[PDB]
Amino acid sequence: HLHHGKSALLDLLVYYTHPDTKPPKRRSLRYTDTHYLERERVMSIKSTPLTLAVSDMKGKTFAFQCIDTPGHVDFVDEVAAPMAISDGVVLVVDVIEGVMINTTRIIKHAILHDMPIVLVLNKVDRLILELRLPPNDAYHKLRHVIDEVNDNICQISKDLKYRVSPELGNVCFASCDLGYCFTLSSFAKLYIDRHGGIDVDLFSKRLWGDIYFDSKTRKFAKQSLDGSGVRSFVHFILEPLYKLHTLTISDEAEKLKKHLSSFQIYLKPKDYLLDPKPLLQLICASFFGFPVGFVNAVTRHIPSPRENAARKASQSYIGPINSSIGKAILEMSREESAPLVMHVTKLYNTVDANNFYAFARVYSGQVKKGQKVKVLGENYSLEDEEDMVVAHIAEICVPCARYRLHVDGAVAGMLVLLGGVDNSISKTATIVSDNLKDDPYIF
């Protein structure tokens, strides 16, 4: 939805991967905006793609080709079009505001299009600092938001494959302003590394609904007759979070310093004398480092392009699967002999409004600059063969919002910006190699 914090989520990763960037003076960084109009209205209007390398919970580095989208109602072009060439949807829902109308629309369209969904409950810190809810009522609010999302999912397809809940690792609790985004498993691991050897998955699966921890028997009860125990999630996650926030805010230098020393987090003496919000950001960045929970959830619950080739071909492609081009799409072959099949769903302005960059996902084959390709329109078919236009490929770039990486060539499964082939494209188009077998089809 609008202003629920989806650009702040990407700014969270940009702060870590790009050390040069610094937060602005009076507002948020809002990386992946890159339009003077959007900087004026302080809201995203265009869907700027961003490719960056992020780190997994264990240390592995992936290559996230994330696409940022507007949250305004009228700009659902920049959600529907880029989603057709993506493998999943990361849904950012404000906990305070809850599920809104655009969130409902996004959920309906994603489930209608067989899109895995990863839920990020943003602006958690507003429960602690603004709404001032007690931890138990905060847990109830989080649970209600998750249940609303699950209801919106169930209104389309009652399949259990699309079900978001923290115990499945499908939901991340985040505060992108303070700079943290954890999961059950990530926070559980952050316990395990400190306190010895216990399986992270077993510990993490017992940190949700009405599972109570008994502080004397050290066991997970089920109902906690009378007041024997307190809820596991609240006992192990929300209360430590509340106490962290309050220690930073409430001006307790010695107590906070001692507690951070226990965690081997060491601050310069001039750091405790900071403004409350930068001090919160510093503490949260030292305590919760890179947002590895979000990366781990995305990698686990969103299929890789090779795994998603079959589903993409079944949904988007309209031609016969048994054909050679259909087989090439299914295998997502990268060799030069393979046919080149790419889908262009967007056109992006250059810095000066002179030429357009075509945003394409290479479904199969390989592409090099200077290549001759044949562009297929929206209604190209055997009846209408006149929508074909032969064009060259001037320049291939990997998008990074505020800059581009120029590559001599690209391979299958990559999202790239193509320069030099935009005149024949209105709205969407399919690009195929000219030296190719007969009967090409369009997406």
Partner: protein, 48 residues
């Protein structure tokens, strides 16, 4: 030279209490919908 200050939490709280008649009570910024600077620039340009 008296160029930078750092105040405690009780001191800032007490100063906020004392000068309570001379500071706004909005903390929202949505109150100035069409009554902020850019809207005034647009109105001046359009002569409305």
């Amino acid at each position: 030279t008296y160029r930078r200050w750092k105040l405690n939490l009780p001191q800032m709280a007490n100063l906020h209490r004392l000068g309570y008649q001379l500071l706004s009570d909005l903390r929202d910024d949505n109150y100035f919908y069409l009554f902020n600077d850019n809207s005034f620039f647009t109105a001046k340009a359009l002569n409305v």
